[PDB]
Enzyme design. Structure first.
Site, PDB file in Angstrom:
ATOM      1  N   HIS A  29      -8.327  -0.082   8.786  1.00 59.11           N
ATOM      2  CA  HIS A  29      -6.988   0.083   9.565  1.00 59.11           C
ATOM      3  C   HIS A  29      -7.224   0.028  10.910  1.00 59.11           C
ATOM      4  CE1 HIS A  29      -5.095   0.872   5.628  1.00 59.11           C
ATOM      5  NE2 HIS A  29      -5.975   2.102   5.639  1.00 59.11           N
ATOM      6  N   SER A  72      -6.924  -0.896   0.821  1.00 65.59           N
ATOM      7  CA  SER A  72      -6.140   0.341   1.121  1.00 65.59           C
ATOM      8  C   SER A  72      -4.665  -0.221   2.206  1.00 65.59           C
ATOM      9  CB  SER A  72      -6.827   1.230   2.236  1.00 65.59           C
ATOM     10  OG  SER A  72      -5.716   2.091   2.946  1.00 65.59           O
ATOM     11  N   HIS A 112       0.191  -3.926   6.584  1.00 70.47           N
ATOM     12  CA  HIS A 112      -0.844  -4.651   6.148  1.00 70.47           C
ATOM     13  C   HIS A 112      -1.792  -4.285   5.413  1.00 70.47           C
TER      14      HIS A 112
END
Lengths: 208, 220
Positions: free
Chosen positions: B49, B118, B125
């Site tokens: 992330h 994830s 995204h």
């Protein structure tokens, strides 16, 4: 300065421990008989980061003090330390944040003696138990992290510790780090080592 | 240079982003089928992330019987090159994959480092991480999109047709979208060493999606 010297101390072998492999055995007498070694990463001779500043045979085993001085390695470590959540969380209450020291503590929590003395390796976790690696900027502070040491033990150590040899790069360290993820019972062994030498996260930078 | 060329070719990654059969302890991870279908310009693919670490894009997403399945594509030249050099210094990779599979250093390193997927947030995204917060989110890497989907037993031929129709379709993501470096990936790697129950969760995920059987590059 973050890229200033970093001292690492800990046991290379605990006499009170029975090695699983007949190769890890390291009796006191044989050790006191043999008792400057290069300090490297995971036993790669192209990753020398400093030297062993002192070695003392004590009651419970062979205690070692090392100094990480490679400018090339400390800088790579510095850069990586700025991009790490573990490090951004900092140490425990009193201890002041030291990114480079914390990254080193998380990455190479173990100490390993090579003589299959050739050199001491900083690694994810030592194969011998009780080989917890303790990092700090001050050598005195580091040795005081281990209860098993007596003032007499510390005096023997103090008298000792008182171009850039790193021929690797960040890529090499990275590949090594992925391997670390697949060493079985890594954390349990580390916790065991921590418990055995009486070192606590609440008084050191140990991440385990 | 020719071999190094093949190593930095695109790498596909596939896997579930959520499993409808898994009930999460934390409400923030709730992602029911109905919400997914309603919610369901390619989304970016990044590392844990981090916006500075975009390595590609999501080629397809599809809700199937067992959950939300996605197919991503790692295209970043700079990222693939970092992975390539690091993989040359990994004992894990040196041992190689199970027999019939051809050794593939880049794919194996990715399989080792970023074994999980994830979802971020309606869909922002997908991130490659060492292990996902949602169970069953094992990441499967390969050079062929088809081969990757063939790794998942739960997927039917019809499911693969739908997915295929998607990835066979230039994105507003892919010069080089990667804005980080080997140092950043190194920083992230140490963090991974202290994720509790990392391997157990990964093995649990592996058995759940049935990749355990189907030979693959998975290292967990």
């Amino acid at each position: 300065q973050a890229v200033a010297p970093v001292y690492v101390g800990g046991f290379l072998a605990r006499y009170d421990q029975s090695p699983d492999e007949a190769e890890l055995l390291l009796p006191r007498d044989v050790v006191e008989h043999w008792l400057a070694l290069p300090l490297n990463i995971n036993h790669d001779d192209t990753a020398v980061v400093g030297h062993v500043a002192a070695m003392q045979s004590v009651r419970d085993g062979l205690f070692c003090l090392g100094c990480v001085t490679s400018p090339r390695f400390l800088e790579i470590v510095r850069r990586a330390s700025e991009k790490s959540e573990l490090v951004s969380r900092g140490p425990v209450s009193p201890l002041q944040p030291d990114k480079v020291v914390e990254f080193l503590s998380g990455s190479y929590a173990g100490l390993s003696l090579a003589s299959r003395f050739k050199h001491v390796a900083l690694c994810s976790v030592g194969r011998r138990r009780g080989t917890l690696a303790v990092y700090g900027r001050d050598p005195e502070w580091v040795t005081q992290r281990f209860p098993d040491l007596t003032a007499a033990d510390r005096d023997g150590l103090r008298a000792q510790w008182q171009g850039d040899p790193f021929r690797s790069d960040s890529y090499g360290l990275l590949g090594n780090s992925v391997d670390a993820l697949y060493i079985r019972e890594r954390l349990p062994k580390l916790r065991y080592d921590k418990q055995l030498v009486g070192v606590t996260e609440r008084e050191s930078y140990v991440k385990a």
